[PDB]
Design a binder for this molecule. Structure first.
Ligand SMILES: Nc1ncnc2c1ncn2[C@@H]1O[C@H](COP(=O)(O)OP(=O)(O)OP(=O)(O)O)[C@@H](O)[C@H]1O
Ligand SMILES: [Mg+2]
Ligand SMILES: [Zn+2]
Lengths: 48, 235, 226
RNA sequence: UGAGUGUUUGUACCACAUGUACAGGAUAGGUAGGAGCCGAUGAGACCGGAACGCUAGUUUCGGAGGAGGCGCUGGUGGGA
């Protein structure tokens, strides 16, 4: 089962990126290092 | 206790889907469901340990007495008395209060306002949990389930499954709670011990939610039965 | 069942009518038939429930007319604070070593006050004070940087008020010796401090019932507005 | 579109009764006052009846009698 997800910056809680993931292959909430335009620096973004 | 549009999904396997429930006060609610249905998970939501993915779970401000399905032994060397004493926050506040006095001596005129307020609350909170409990707990064992005092000085990890259940149940009562959340309170108890638990729960004036797989035990106490469905993910 | 003096006092009082402050104090003075300098006390039944941490209240209020009974003062200090107590003329002035003597000695002192630093050392003895309730508390003001203010307040008749478990708080305003006007002024001071102490989370009417009573007499209900 | 009766009920006063964990003298509900309090307006002790009761005592009504007790005080207990 593949579904679209939103990645939110853990620092400013800004819903920054849109992506998708296969729930079966990645049961746990995805986490990436992505640029946060509000803070203008790379930060940890976690799926909500 | 009320929950609306409850949603919770661990990975790919979901627990609640748009579930709802309203429990009136002073209701001895019997929670029933197959293993894995999500009965323990409901309490975790009430205790705010878990958060619903979507929806609102509403709990009253009253103090809650929680009896975990599994015994929580923080350290192997913990004694039964230490385990029971941890039920009340007397020891924790005193350690904080003792530190507050230390800070007062070090700091002269900077943090006194903050320290004085913290000291006052601890004293008022300490008196609310009357420090006379040291004697009451010692005798709560006698009147509760005939728990011998030799066990009182023995490591908790060395007790038998039935003995551990008695200690954990007494700890919940020792805390003097307002709402009782009992998760299989008679898992290992023998026939004689179950009688005391049943009588106490019949007499208990407050609200008590019971997760139990013992039909006969529930029937003597329960007035409202809450069924957690495993296939419909509803309540 | 009821003494004749109490019966006549009851007939004087009107249970249905909640008197004004002036009528209530005068009526209480009339009702205390017992021929001793009884202390007049006021009891407020607050809507707040103590079981909530914020709701409970515990403080101290100074009465310009006083309580009508002098209050012995015990002070714990060291150095300039000790000199402050001596200048204030505190009934008893002590230190960390003298706390042990105070335990079992000089007892019956009405109030106990300790400096912020002395509290740490005092705390050991204070656990014994706890059940007695003498232990100084910052909220009541017993713990202050200056003991002279505490001593003068105690002499004037400062009274510490603490809400009981049921939500009723009692305090003596003065002796039947004090004139009814002085007693009413003391009641007003008590009323003002309680209103200022009303907690934020409280709701509805703040006081469910206000009753003034002498040690011998029965209760008299007093109008809240008065 | 108004009268009553009765029943089962929820609320709110007013009457009452109960408060036994441990130790403690013992049936200790909490807080405030409390050195004085109560009794020929019939006290103590005593007899019975009744209620409670954790069976230890508690509370209460009556019968006689007629003036005493209780408290502070004392140690216990967190609390007298
Ligand atoms: N963090 C988690 N990660 C993955 N799955 C989980 C997690 N938490 C719970 N689950 C699943 O939730 C399901 C139901 O939760 P819960 O443990 O409360 O069931 P239960 O009814 O209390 O079990 P029992 O009645 O037998 O004690 C479990 O089967 C469990 O597998
Ligand atoms: Mg479970
Ligand atoms: Zn950010």
């Amino acid at each position: 089962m593949r579904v679209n997800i939103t990645l939110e910056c853990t620092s400013c809680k800004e819903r920054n990126y849109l992506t998708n993931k296969n729930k079966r292959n990645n049961p746990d909430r995805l986490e990436k290092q992505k640029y946060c335009p509000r803070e203008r620096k790379v930060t940890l973004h976690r799926e909500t | 206790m009320r929950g609306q549009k409850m949603n919770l999904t661990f990975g790919l396997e979901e627990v609640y889907e748009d579930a709802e429930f309203h429990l009136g006060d002073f209701d001895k609610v019997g929670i029933v469901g197959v293993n894995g249905a999500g009965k323990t998970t409901l309490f975790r939501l009430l205790l705010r340990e878990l958060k619903l993915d979507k929806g609102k779970i509403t709990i009253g401000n009253s103090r809650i007495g929680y009896l975990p399905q599994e015994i929580i032994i923080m350290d192997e060397k913990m004694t039964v008395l230490e385990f029971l004493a941890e039920g009340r926050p007397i020891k924790k506040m005193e350690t904080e209060l003792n530190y507050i006095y230390e800070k007062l001596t070090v700091v002269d005129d900077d943090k006194q306002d903050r320290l004085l307020k913290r000291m006052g609350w601890l004293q008022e909170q300490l008196e609310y949990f009357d420090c006379y409990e040291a004697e009451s707990i010692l005798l709560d064992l006698v009147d509760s389930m005939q728990i011998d005092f030799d066990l009182f000085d023995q490591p908790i990890s060395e007790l038998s499954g039935g003995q551990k259940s008695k200690i954990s149940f007494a700890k919940v009562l020792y805390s003097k709670p307002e709402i009782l959340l009992l998760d299989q309170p008679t898992n290992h108890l023998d026939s004689s011990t179950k009688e005391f638990v049943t009588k106490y729960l019949k007499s208990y004036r407050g609200s008590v939610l019971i997760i139990s797989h013992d039909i006969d035990f529930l029937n003597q106490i329960i007035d409202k039965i809450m069924y957690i469905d495993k296939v419909t993910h509803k309540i | 069942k009821k003494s004749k003096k109490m019966q006549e006092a009851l007939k004087k009082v009107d249970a249905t009518k909640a008197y004004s402050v002036e009528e209530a104090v005068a009526l209480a003075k009339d009702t205390n038939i017992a021929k001793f300098d009884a202390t007049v006390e006021v009891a407020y039944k607050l809507n707040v429930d103590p079981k909530k941490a914020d709701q409970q209240i515990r403080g101290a209020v100074v009465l310009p007319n006083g309580t009508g009974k002098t209050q012995t003062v015990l002070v714990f200090a060291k150095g300039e604070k000790a000199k402050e107590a001596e200048a204030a003329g505190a009934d008893f002035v002590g230190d960390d070593d003298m706390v042990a003597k105070i335990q079992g000695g000089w007892f019956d002192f009405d109030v106990v006050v300790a400096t912020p630093d002395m509290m740490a050392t005092v705390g050991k003895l204070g656990r014994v004070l706890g059940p007695k309730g003498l232990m100084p508390n910052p909220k009541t003001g017993t713990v202050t940087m200056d003991v002279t203010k505490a001593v003068e307040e105690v002499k004037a008749g400062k009274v510490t008020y603490r809400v009981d478990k049921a939500g009723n708080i009692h305090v003596p305003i003065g002796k039947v010796s004090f004139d009814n006007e002085k007693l009413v002024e003391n009641f007003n001071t008590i009323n003002d401090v309680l209103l200022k102490a009303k907690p934020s989370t409280a709701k509805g009417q703040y006081i469910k019932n206000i009753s003034v009573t002498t040690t011998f007499g029965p209760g008299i209900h007093v109008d809240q507005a008065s």
